[PDB]
Amino acid sequence: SSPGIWQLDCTHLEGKVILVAVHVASGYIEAEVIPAETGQETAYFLLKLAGRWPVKTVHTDNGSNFTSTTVKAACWWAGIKQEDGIPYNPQSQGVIESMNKELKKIIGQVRDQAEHLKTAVQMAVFIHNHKRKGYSAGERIVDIIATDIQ
Amino acid sequence: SPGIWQLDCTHLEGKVILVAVHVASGYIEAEVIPAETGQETAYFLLKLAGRWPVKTVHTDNGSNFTSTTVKAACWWAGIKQEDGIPYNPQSQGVIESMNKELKKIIGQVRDQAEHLKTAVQMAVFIHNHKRKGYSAGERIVDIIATDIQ
Numbered sequence A: 001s002s003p004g005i006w007q008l009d010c011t012h013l014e015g016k017v018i019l020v021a022v023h024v025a026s027g028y029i030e031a032e033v034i035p036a037e038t039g040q041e042t043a044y045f046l047l048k049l050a051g052r053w054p055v056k057t058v059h060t061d062n063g064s065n066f067t068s069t070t071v072k073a074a075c076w077w078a079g080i081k082q083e084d085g086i087p088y089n090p091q092s093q094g095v096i097e098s099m100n101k102e103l104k105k106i107i108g109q110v111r112d113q114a115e116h117l118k119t120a121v122q123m124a125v126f127i128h129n130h131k132r133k134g135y136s137a138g139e140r141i142v143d144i145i146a147t148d149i150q
Numbered sequence B: 001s002p003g004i005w006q007l008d009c010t011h012l013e014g015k016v017i018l019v020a021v022h023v024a025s026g027y028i029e030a031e032v033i034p035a036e037t038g039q040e041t042a043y044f045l046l047k048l049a050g051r052w053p054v055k056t057v058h059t060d061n062g063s064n065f066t067s068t069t070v071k072a073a074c075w076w077a078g079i080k081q082e083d084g085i086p087y088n089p090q091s092q093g094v095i096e097s098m099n100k101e102l103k104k105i106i107g108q109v110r111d112q113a114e115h116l117k118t119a120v121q122m123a124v125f126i127h128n129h130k131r132k133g134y135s136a137g138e139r140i141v142d143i144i145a146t147d148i149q
């Protein structure tokens, strides 16, 4: 059920890890900088996400997070169906790849305005979600979910 | 009114919980911080505005209203920074009641989480999903979707 489907994505910059959740149907994202991708960090990130949006299903970004007892506990707690992230549809890889490149580009364009990477990442989230493509990802996610509620 | 948020700072376990409330829906986001500085508040607002269409923020106190860092974040994110003076006196009691409710939920989950920040995010989840019959999460999406359309 596509209003509730999210995909996890982990990318790297400046020796740090950027964890991204993408609302598949809209392209809307949330993201955080973490020192390393652990089960505990991923679990906490998912808890935050699911408190903020109606997360029904998460396609996990790798097998370690899929396997993680802590991630499984968070998904249980928050009522999330934890699934694999195998791109049975091969265009999924390229879409995530393209978004990571886009995000890193935006981070570069703002990096000087922020002392810390985490600030630049949140600026990138803002720019990404507001970008008009003509609706924005932020507009699309609200519309999709509102239509589902109705 | 679809774009109006209110900041709220409350305390528990010698730590600070910073809350943003979407006034029309009662929907919240929250974080635990060591202390409420301009820098922490600024970063919190940047996060919020990247996630929801934040037009106006009623700041929680005069220090954050005055803060150059908070003003910079509001400028960056296109947020109108306003005071949080309750010209409508029922605003105080509503925020008061929510802080009490949140602390209650935190108590009900505190044992399930080692760290306060986890308990706070559990509380955010429970608050936003609670049916009152629609939930705050349902109301915010409906309000904003109607505004877009």
Ligand SMILES: O=C(O)CC[C@H]1COc2c(ccc(/C=C3/C(=N/O)Cc4ccccc43)c2C(=O)O)O1
Residues within 6 Å of the ligand: A039, A040, A041, A043, A044, A047, A070, A073, A074, A075, A077, A078, B112, B113, B114, B115, B116, B117, B118, B119
């Ligand atoms: O560094 C960061 O940002 C996050 C680091 C840690 C913060 O603390 C935690 C964390 C990750 C997990 C936990 C534990 C959970 C449970 N244990 O049963 C049940 C549960 C249900 C849902 C979510 C988390 C937990 C904790 C915690 O124990 O509080 O992420």
Ligand SMILES: O=C(O)CC[C@H]1COc2c(ccc(/C=C3/C(=N/O)Cc4ccccc43)c2C(=O)O)O1
Residues within 6 Å of the ligand: A113, A114, A115, A116, A117, A118, A119, A120, B039, B040, B042, B043, B046, B069, B072, B073, B074, B076
């Ligand atoms: O501890 C935590 O979680 C948050 C602490 C810090 C994280 O870093 C920061 C922070 C708060 C502020 C900044 C600086 C900003 C600017 N300077 O011009 C312009 C700007 C525009 C918008 C938002 C932040 C900033 C930084 C930073 O410089 O990166 O919050």
Ligand SMILES: [Cl-]
Residues within 6 Å of the ligand: B016, B035, B036
């Ligand atoms: Cl304080």
